[PDB]
Every structure is written in structure tokens, then in C-alpha cells.
């Protein structure tokens with residue numbers, strides 16, 4: 091598993107398209123080791139390939155698989171405002187749910 | 202080095218922008234092993250990070266470094282017509298010089 095970070099920020103839709111353009115996907119950490127590896131390649135807050143768009147508070151990867159390992163920031167996920175269904179990795183390595191329409195860096199995953 | 206191929210076709214400047222978006226570069230094989238590795242990921246004709254834009258018939262990688270290893274297809278490079286200053290990897294692994302404004306898949310290189 092190889093991880094690469096984007097340089098510019100963009101909404102999840104464009105982020106997914108970017109990783110997919112090179113036949114990869116948006117990074118989804120499966121354990122603390124991968125979480126750290128992704129954190130290190132990202133120089134700022136970045137999207138992860140996790141969302142609860144299909145069912146609220148049910149987080150799954152971009153292929154529909156529910157995630158087991160999670161690393162939520164204290165107080166998260168809180169689905170604030172009109173809703174937050176996407177997930178970003180903070181620069182401390184913890185996760186925060188955010189609006190999928192907002193712009194952040196993206197870390198892509200390749201195998 | 203890790204090599205990944207794009208899904209869509211685009212001209213060289215767009216190809217460079219794509220690879221650089223993930224902090225990579227357009228694949229430049231330095232030997233036959235890497236050439237075959239790029240072959241493994243390219244399902245169709247793809248751009249390589251090589252051009253003779255500075256001086257005709259003097260090929261350099263995208264950072265202006267003159268390359269040594271080459272794997273030109275028989276009869277190439279021939280700089281046909283108004284000029285061919287970019288390079289693509291044919292599906293047989295050999296190279297052809299083409300117009301930088303023409304569209305092809307791109308193979309990006311990461312380390």
C-alpha cells in the first residue's frame with residue numbers, strides 16, 4: 091500500500107476523481123500504522139476515503155465496506171451544521187467529520 | 202520507484218500537471234527493468250518524461266537532465282512534420298517521438 095498527498099485543496103468529489111485518475115482511491119486507514127503513514131504524507135488536513143452518506147453515523151469506505159478501525163478526535167463525529175458526511179485526518183492524526191462540499195487536501199492510496 | 206497509469210488521455214503539459222498534483226513526475230525509465238515496469242502498467246500508448254524541446258535530437262528528462270538509456274522503436278526518433286519533441290512508450294515497449302500537443306495516457310512515477 092502506497093500513499094501520496096495532493097498539493098492543492100478540493101472537495102471530496104474532485105478528490106475521488108483525482109485518486110481514481112491514477113487508478114487508486116482516497117486513503118482509508120485500516121489501523122494505527124496506516125493512519126500514521128497517511129498523516130506523515132499529508133502536510134495539512136486531508137480527506138480520507140470514509141463517509142456516512144448512505145446511512146448517518148454508519149461510516150464506510152468508498153466501496154461500501156463499514157470501517158472497523160477509527161481514530162476520532164474527541165467530540166467527533168458530531169455531524170454539525172446542516173450535516174457532515176465526509177471525513178478528514180487532522181494534522182494530529184485524529185479524525186473529524188466535515189461537509190463533503192468543503193475543500194481539503196487529499197491522500198490517495200495505491201497498491 | 203512506483204509507477205501508475207492514468208485512465209484518460211491528455212497532452213504532455215496536462216500529464217505533467219496530473220503527476221505533479223500528487224507530487225510525482227512523468228515516468229522516465231533509466232534502464233530496461235524500469236521500462237518493462239512501465240509497460241506492466243500502461244495498457245495503451247503512454248507519455249514518458251522525456252523531450253528534446255531544448256535542442257532537437259538531444260533528449261532530456263523533464264528536469265533538463267540528458268538521458269542515457271533509450272529504447273527507440275525502429276525508425277525513431279524521426280521528428281515528423283512540424284515536429285515531434287515529446288516521447289511515448291508504444292505497446293511493444295519501444296519508444297516513439299510525438300507532438301507534445303497530442304494526447305496519450307500518462308504513466309506517473311513516485312518514489
Ligand SMILES: OC[C@H]1O[C@H](O)[C@@H](O)[C@@H](O)[C@@H]1O
Nearest residue numbers: 165166168170174186187188
Ligand atoms: O469544534 C469542532 C468542530 O469544528 C468545526 O465546526 C468543524 O471542523 C466541525 O467538523 C468540528 O466538529
Ligand SMILES: OC[C@H]1O[C@H](O)[C@@H](O)[C@@H](O)[C@@H]1O
Nearest residue numbers: 276277279281285297298299
Ligand atoms: O510510422 C511512424 C510514424 O507514425 C506516425 O506518423 C507518428 O506516430 C510518428 O510519430 C511515427 O514516427
Ligand SMILES: [Ca+2]
Nearest residue numbers: 142169174175
Ligand atoms: Ca454525517
Ligand SMILES: [Ca+2]
Nearest residue numbers: 168169186187
Ligand atoms: Ca465534525
Ligand SMILES: [Ca+2]
Nearest residue numbers: 253280285286
Ligand atoms: Ca524533436
Ligand SMILES: [Ca+2]
Nearest residue numbers: 279280297298
Ligand atoms: Ca515519431
